[PDB]
Amino acid sequence: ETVPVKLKPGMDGPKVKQWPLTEEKIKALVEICTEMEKEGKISKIGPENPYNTPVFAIKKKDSTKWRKLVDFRELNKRTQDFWEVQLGIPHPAGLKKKKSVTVLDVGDAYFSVPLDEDFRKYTAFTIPSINNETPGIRYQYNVLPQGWKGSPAIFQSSMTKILEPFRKQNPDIVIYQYMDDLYVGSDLEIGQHRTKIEELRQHLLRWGLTGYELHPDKWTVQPIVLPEKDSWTVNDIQKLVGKLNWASQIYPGIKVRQLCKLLRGTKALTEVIPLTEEAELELAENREILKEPVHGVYYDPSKDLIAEIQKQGQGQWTYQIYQEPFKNLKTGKYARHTNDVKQLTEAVQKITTESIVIWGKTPKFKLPIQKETWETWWTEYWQATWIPEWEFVNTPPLVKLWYQ
Amino acid sequence: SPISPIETVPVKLKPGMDGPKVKQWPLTEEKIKALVEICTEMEKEGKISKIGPENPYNTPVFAIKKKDSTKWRKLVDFRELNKRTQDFWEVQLGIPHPAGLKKKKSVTVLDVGDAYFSVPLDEDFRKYTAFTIPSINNETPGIRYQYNVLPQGWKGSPAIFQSSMTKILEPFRKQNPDIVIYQYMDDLYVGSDLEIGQHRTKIEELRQHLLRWGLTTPDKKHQKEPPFLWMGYELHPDKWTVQPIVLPEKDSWTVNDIQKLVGKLNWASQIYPGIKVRQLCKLLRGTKALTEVIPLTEEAELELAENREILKEPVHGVYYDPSKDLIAEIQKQGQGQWTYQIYQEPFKNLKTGKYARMRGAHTNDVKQLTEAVQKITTESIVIWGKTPKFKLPIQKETWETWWTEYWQATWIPEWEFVNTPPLVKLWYQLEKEPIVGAETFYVDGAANRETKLGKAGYVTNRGRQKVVTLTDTTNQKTELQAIYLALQDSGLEVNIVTDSQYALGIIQAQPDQSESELVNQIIEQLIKKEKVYLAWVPAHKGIGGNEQVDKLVSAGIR
Ligand SMILES: N#Cc1cc(Cl)cc(Oc2cc(OCc3n[nH]c4ccccc34)ccc2Cl)c1
């Protein structure tokens, strides 16, 4: 007996366009839906269904098997009241504290549960043809679709049951469910951890359900880093007071006066200048200041999370997560046969998964790329069962350095 | 005509809305007559059914004559019903491109006759399609009718017909995997590799299967012969091309003549390599009236001419062999103009095309080249389902240098350099470090938001100093002007410190062309230099030479 889904009032189904797919991914998808149709998970549909969600074919992490990935970002937004303020899955602040967190796929739990007949249409998607030889193959789900945030919201009750024994027997293990995945944290020895996971997999196995090791607690800083040196130049000071200046506003109490007076008159850039010790007091206070958190910055659940990424060079990328510009909740660095897109994709997922662990919600990405490039390529490297939201930006010449 | 035995597509009105109820204008006797003649026939053939006055709905009906002829056509204004009908799925979201067609032994085109009228309409929706043939003026209540088939002009016909034709073909497609059927509107394009025998035969098993489902098609002798004049193309059995392009010789060109011109050209551009259209296009800028004659600029005169030559002689394209690769070649035509050719076998093009677009206000060839590669990549996936191998007029060394240092992620799929000038390069590089024994120019610029008056100048560490007044500027303009001065009064090597992230960002990107003349002069200056270093400092921070030009250019201004 299905639970009923109602769209967020005065708004209706997603009518999202479908990206051109390559022959290889189109065939991979046809085979899949052919089988899903048989299993009765989805059903072909008539023109009288105006909706659409894009569908892609990914390969996963170190996998030879094609996997289907439906982009329910739009459908998600239009149902936010259901899966959030009505059938929400509480996020445990304990998770981020665990020595080890393992990620398991659980999306297969949904095809055993039926979808509200009246909501089915909203899950329509298309398998495109090539050179428009023919009409795409239209489908709609009959069961909880993977990728749709309503799925784990509904399955919540069944999941709670599936896990009751395990949890009862390991009160110090944290299990969080974010969409298709299960996050299991423990402070156990790796071997005892790996063991409990396999033990947890068995429970899962008795209900049908059939890891990837994260180590949150060892997720540390990345303070703005000021250079230490012998023999300074007008330039280096200039760079220093500029970087230190920008470090302010976000960092509380950054002083630059001292460093500034050394730059008096109009001198050459190459010209070397002796650092007055008080200046060092500043570098000291600033360095010390920079090596700490922010103070005053807290996460507000009613606010979207934002992630900026900067291409530094040589396989290195920097990133910051905040809700209010300059009020950084977290910042770090992802370091790499990898190309710019492959690498950037890998950062997006890395950051996202941490966000899911820390705040139990994904950031909206500001990607330093061409909307078009990203769009054609991102799928060749996507491995996640979810997709974060993203806009495209032109990185600010300075921000990149101030963060290196 | 048969009316397909097939299943019906449930149709619904838009939520919170009711069927239409529009009043019928009264028509002349000659028209009421025609409609009565037309309608009885339709009713006879089952197309429409007579109903009573208990049906509250109504659409207006009308009857037109025959331009030249003496027949009457009945027009049903389905505007209000369409506005009340649910939205349907988008029919076809693209159309087959010839160059994506694979060569087939034999192909027969099959147009379904009376398409919409050969397919039924949801029993419970038929009611909203009610219309009335008014009585002779006011007396007598009209003659009410309603549809049993897909009406012409109605929102859902194209969608429901296609669906039906899809459902009607599925069966056949199973027992005929080797057969290609192109569904386009109410046409069917059939091609197989069997000998004429099993073909002229298989086509028959098709037409027949079509008929058990109420669908009639043309039989041989009536089936069209190659070359197919389809969609502006010419479909020969071994090649393809756009239909004959006729470039109108003229005395005076009006806005509307150039417009049509540009279009014939652009269409021609899909197989005729080297078609340029920027000069012809510039004229249209701001354009007076449709009938306003525009004097052909001499570059435009020169473009039109070069185009005429390209068009002199016919060019054709080949078809797609799925086993060979795809090779994409790009060339720089100049003024942000690119041209590409796509072939599988060296110089036997499947198709050509061009890229112009000005992505950004300041750009360079490296940025443009990769924008065209992406535009082409997409194009390929669309037509062939796979991306081509590229041959670009850019040195692998240039590419590396640029991609490596650029702030933005960039990625060209498989490529190979091909020496086909002009070759793509970088016209200048900014040093990473300050130039020893080079004049440090501390530039700056200010502008009064009220008077629009500006001031741009610089103070060097070598004693030099300058300030220039600008009349209708902005801060951005003054700050770029300041850098221009420094580049003018400085010689082969300089160090430049500004507090303009805006100017910085603009230059740091190695632009080689801009919509701004200023930016263009700067570029010209940057290319002249032997080495330039450009740094940024915050403003209103007591930074050395900085705080010095500020007072200089702030005087009067602010
Ligand atoms: N009108 C139309 C019209 C419009 C479209 Cl989009 C397609 C069509 O049928 C074909 C064309 C093909 O490509 C080239 C070709 N192979 N063999 C041929 C014989 C004669 C002419 C062209 C060809 C290959 C297969 C088919 Cl199904 C006919």
| Total count of domains of chain B | 5
Query: How many helical elements of chain B?
Result: 13
What is the H/E order of chain A?
Answer: HEEEHHEEEHEEHEEHHEHEEEHEHEH
Cross-sheet strand order for the largest sheet of chain A: 14-13-12-15-16
Number of β-strand runs of chain A: 16
With strands numbered from the N-terminus, the spatial order across the biggest sheet of chain B is: 15-14-13-17-18
How is the biggest beta sheet of chain B arranged?
A: 5 strands, mixed
Helical amount among residues of chain A, as a percent range?
A: 25-40%
Sheet having the most strands of chain A:
5 strands, mixed
The Rg value of chain A, from CA coordinates, equals 25 Å
CATH homolog superfamily of the largest domain in chain A: HIV Type 1 Reverse Transcriptase, subunit A, domain 1
The CATH homologous superfamily of the largest domain in chain B is termed HIV Type 1 Reverse Transcriptase, subunit A, domain 1
Largest interface by residue count? A-B, 69 and 76 residues
Q: β content of chain B, as a range?
A: 15-25%
Radius of gyration of chain B: 34 Å
Helix content of chain B: 25-40%
Q: What class do helices, strands and sheet pairing of chain A give?
A: alpha+beta
PDB class: transferase
Keywords: HIV-1 reverse transcriptase, non-nucleoside inhibition, nucleotidyltrasferase, aids, Aspartyl protease, Capsid maturation, Capsid protein, Cytoplasm, DNA integration, DNA recombination, DNA-directed DNA polymerase, Endonuclease, Host-virus interaction, Hydrolase
Assembly: dimeric
Entry title: Crystal Structure of HIV Reverse Transcriptase in complex with inhibitor 22
